[PDB]
Symmetry: D2
Subunit: 286 residues, 4 copies
Amino acid sequence: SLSPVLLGIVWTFLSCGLLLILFFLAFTIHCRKNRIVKMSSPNLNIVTLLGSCLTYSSAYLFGIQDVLSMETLIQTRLSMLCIGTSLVFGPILGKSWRLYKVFTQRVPDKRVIIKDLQLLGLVAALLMADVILLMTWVLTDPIQCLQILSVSMTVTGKDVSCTSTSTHFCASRYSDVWIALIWGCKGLLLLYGAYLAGLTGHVSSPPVNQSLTIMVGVNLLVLAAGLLFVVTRYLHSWPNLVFGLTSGGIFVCTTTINCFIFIPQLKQWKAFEEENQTIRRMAKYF
Amino acid sequence: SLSPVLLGIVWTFLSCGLLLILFFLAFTIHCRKNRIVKMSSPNLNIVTLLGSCLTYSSAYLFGIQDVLVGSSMETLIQTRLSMLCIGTSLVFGPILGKSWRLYKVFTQRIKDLQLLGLVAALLMADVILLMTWVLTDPIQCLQILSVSMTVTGKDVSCTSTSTHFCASRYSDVWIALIWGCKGLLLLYGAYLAGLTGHVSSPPVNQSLTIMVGVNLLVLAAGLLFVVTRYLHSWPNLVFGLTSGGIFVCTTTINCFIFIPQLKQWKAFEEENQTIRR
Amino acid sequence: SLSPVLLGIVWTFLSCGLLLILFFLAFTIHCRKNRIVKMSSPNLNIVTLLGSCLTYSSAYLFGIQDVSMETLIQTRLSMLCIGTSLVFGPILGKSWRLYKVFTQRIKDLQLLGLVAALLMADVILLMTWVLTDPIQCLQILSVSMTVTGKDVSCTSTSTHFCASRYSDVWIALIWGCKGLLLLYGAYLAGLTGHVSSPPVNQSLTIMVGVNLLVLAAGLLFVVTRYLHSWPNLVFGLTSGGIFVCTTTINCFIFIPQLKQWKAFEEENQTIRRMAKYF
Amino acid sequence: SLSPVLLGIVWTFLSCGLLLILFFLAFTIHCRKNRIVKMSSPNLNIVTLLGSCLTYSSAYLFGIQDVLVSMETLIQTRLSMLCIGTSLVFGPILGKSWRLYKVFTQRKDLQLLGLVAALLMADVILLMTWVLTDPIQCLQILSVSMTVTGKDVSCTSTSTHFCASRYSDVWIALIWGCKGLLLLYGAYLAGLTGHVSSPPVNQSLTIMVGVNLLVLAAGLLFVVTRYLHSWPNLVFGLTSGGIFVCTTTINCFIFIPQLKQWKAFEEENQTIRRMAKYF
Ligand SMILES: CCCCCC/C=C/CCCCCCCC(=O)OC[C@H](COP(=O)([O-])OCC[N+](C)(C)C)OC(=O)CCCCCCCCCCCCCCCCC
Ligand SMILES: CCCCCC/C=C/CCCCCCCC(=O)OC[C@H](COP(=O)([O-])OCC[N+](C)(C)C)OC(=O)CCCCCCCCCCCCCCCCC
Ligand SMILES: CCCCCC/C=C/CCCCCCCC(=O)OC[C@H](COP(=O)([O-])OCC[N+](C)(C)C)OC(=O)CCCCCCCCCCCCCCCCC
Ligand SMILES: CCCCCC/C=C/CCCCCCCC(=O)OC[C@H](COP(=O)([O-])OCC[N+](C)(C)C)OC(=O)CCCCCCCCCCCCCCCCC
């Protein structure tokens, strides 16, 4: 079905990205008490990294074809993408909202319980929205792999033509409804994320400020989703191209998001440790 | 197939919206030199007014069936969709330009010419996409009658459907292109609205207008995409929903732009009258 | 020459102020690790409370009259200068750190080093004041014949005062350096204006403190210079000005922390009550 | 009395500064409708320049000595001119900063003129109270003082003639105090508008430089006037130099960016005009 060379290349790239995510997770857990890591949100960074792992896993699953049960495979690979995107992007919006609310306090500080509940609601409520949409899609209009043989007798204003096509595709009866819903909810939450990124545009440094990561992420996500919807819909007779493009889009988006989140943490951690070592040796020498 | 009552109600609502648009245009052209109107960029508002009237015109065009005088339904669909696209571009360009100017003035301080040039570039992108859509494949209407046997691996069903629709061969690709470029524009507009957050008063600060407009645009566009895709056997429902969405979005955006200007103008003039006496 | 009643009232007020300062010190030492206290730089608040203690001690020292007197006056004036520098340094450091983290991002050691340089400026000025010319007390008796060009008047005055030969130069120096510091502090308070909550944003406290500081310094300079034949008035006004300024600044620093802490632990207690109920 | 060379040099420098103020006034009035000038506050800049003129005029008066043998009113008017000139220089800048802060924090020249009118009325009532209650008197006193320490005794013979007020330090502390409170609020305003716009519109740097230079100059000149009355040339030169430096620095910081951004605008206009002529 799919060429072994493309499968090997995609598997290698996905495994390398997964190893990078594991290294970031190890850095976050081990250096959790460090000032550079602590001034970030390591507990939210964990959720982002689990979402990244889910996205890479779904990218792996996209390569299985003509093996399985196929309806459940498509349903679970797509649900994994949706939940992974929610888990990747919710924490970043929560961090931006926290940074915005910290630096715009007033006399009516409200209550810390309400602030914590709103922070939890900018993540868990989004995840629950995706969960209920996926449950409604699965229970109401599940993906069905059906084969149609059909003869079509179309006619234009003056020309008559006849076609006879047989195809084997897996999709829902009302697939565009669920597409418009999930695309729509993600787009509204990402518009609010862009608003939050703008509101906190120059409020702190890239390790704490998350405006650039949000903007790059939303733009890349819109581009990748727009491309992949179209190529999956129309270039269904190009299995290698569709698989490679889907894996590449998922890989690029996840890797760019995580690199933008974590590379500055590593840079400032190295700088802080170098400063500490310099002062330690200067004190020891004297 | 369109009920006269729905047509009458929709026409009256769109006419009232157009009269509101013309009132705002007269207000912003007559009272150009006033401080309240002048500080809100009266020249850039003309483009928004023209885009709004173009969108209302497209909403009118959505309500006629068959042919005008022996004409082509293809041309009607193409022209109303392109009118809607150009109108939304012209509505949302000036607001983003005003927000960008406010941001740049706030941060290490832009004439109207540069903003109009950026809006013109946006319009050129939309025009290029519309032109390549029209030339690469038109929206030709086809009569599709066919018989298909469905084999799910457990049951066999035969159906005979005679369907007529006006669409492109690859219509989802053009949908993806137009929606995607508009969505990138809206993402940058939301970023700009956040950047100019609580930077001035609402007459000068066009930040709530952007956030209301982008959300209304996304919601209406998704709803109407789905409804047109699937509920094509409900011409009255499709027409009413499309006209209602266009009217609601355009009127909300224009009111959010112009009600602060009008009330601040009234307050300023009343204060001047009190001072003079 | 000072009434016992005024002495007792002033000492009771200063002792209550010291008790309040010690209560704030206990609160900020015990509740070091709390979020509300930790986000308000508990290490830089110790320096402010120490400076407040020095200022209250100098206010106490202002009330003893007879017994050398030069060492007493120099001691209390230098204590006041050191205490006010220690009070106002940490607030400026906190505002500077808030500005730096807000504007494209500072350890406590760097801020304490800046405060140490600020203190060293005052130490240098006080040392050169004490060594160049001390505050020796002289009994001056003289006969003066005034000729204004239209009338002739004669007066004989026997006056005693403790001052330096060039006292206004040292005044203008100390006042000038403190005023430059206060102007930069007001600039910092403006920069970090409506940037965070009161316990973190030390902006109203800076403005109130500098305004009260200028007012009290001007009033007490004039009163000491001219109303020297009113010992009770001078003592009461000096002690009251010191007490009012110090107490106002420290209350503005610490009362927001106390109420936010009370709200925080009230919320925690409600959470624990809900957990126990289920 | 005073050396002719120092008098000539000080008069030359003050005249050059006054001509610079006149040039700035001509530029402000002539190009009052220009966009760069209009987005500034030319009506308030006129008040600043008039205050600068008063401050430059008082420096000339500080050089008149041993001529009006009349000397009390000369000192009173030269000092009142300084106080009013400082008020008129610094009030408009604070008003511009406050207007900029209020425009960009929302939920007009007449109002700012009223505010600076109140600011000047404060100085007017202080100066009137000083003149009416405790005016300057030029008095000559001869006296002998028997200074005795704890163990040492000495006698001195002093005969001096100085023009000063009886409670001079009271009025000093008052005027210094009110000015210092206004300068503290001005520094607060400069902080509030720290990075709100460009230097032509933003006035934070000019405010901070002005308040620092003003405090430093006033502190120096108080001490040298008090303790170096036997150095007439030194005190005259230092007072004139401080006044000149403060006024010139403040006015340059206000107006040089306007000239820069006006010349750049005119150059752009000329370039586009030439391009239009080409096509
Ligand atoms: C941070 C990293 C994560 C981001 C990765 C972005 C990559 C997305 C690629 C997956 C999307 C293309 C696949 C479409 C569905 C498909 O395979 O067809 C089966 C079918 C549709 O098939 P079909 O319609 O494409 O082909 C049949 C054509 N026919 C003519 C018959 C209709 O899927 C569905 O029925 C819809 C299920 C929706 C579930 C959610 C999809 C996954 C969500 C992941 C993106 C969400 C986040 C981004 C949103 C956008 C930004 C606001
Ligand atoms: C501020 C006011 C502006 C907001 C108004 C929002 C209202 C939109 C309603 C019109 C859109 C639905 C109609 C879709 C096309 C149609 O009718 O079918 C003909 C066809 C599609 O037909 P079809 O697919 O819908 O039905 C046939 C089904 N079949 C199975 C055969 C495929 O149109 C096209 O081919 C695509 C043309 C693209 C041109 C652009 C459309 C106008 C753009 C206006 C919105 C852009 C701005 C907002 C975007 C959202 C934010 C990112
Ligand atoms: C936060 C709490 C701190 C604020 C408390 C404010 C209270 C200040 C009261 C003390 C100042 C008045 C006493 C003056 C000296 C005196 O007593 O006479 C002895 C003498 C002067 O005597 P005399 O000149 O006043 O009387 C003699 C008159 N005769 C005619 C002879 C000249 O002292 C000196 O010689 C100068 C000593 C300078 C040392 C520094 C003084 C203490 C500084 C404390 C304030 C600094 C911070 C604020 C600065 C202002 C804002 C920028
Ligand atoms: C922006 C441009 C303006 C800035 C120019 C700054 C320069 C100031 C120099 C003038 C001040 C020194 C002269 C003092 C008075 C004098 O000459 O002696 C006669 C006398 C004092 O004499 P004497 O005490 O110096 O000498 C006699 C000594 N004896 C022992 C006898 C007392 O003046 C007075 O009586 C007081 C009158 C007060 C009127 C106001 C003075 C002018 C105000 C100008 C500055 C205001 C703005 C800055 C304020 C500070 C910042 C917050």
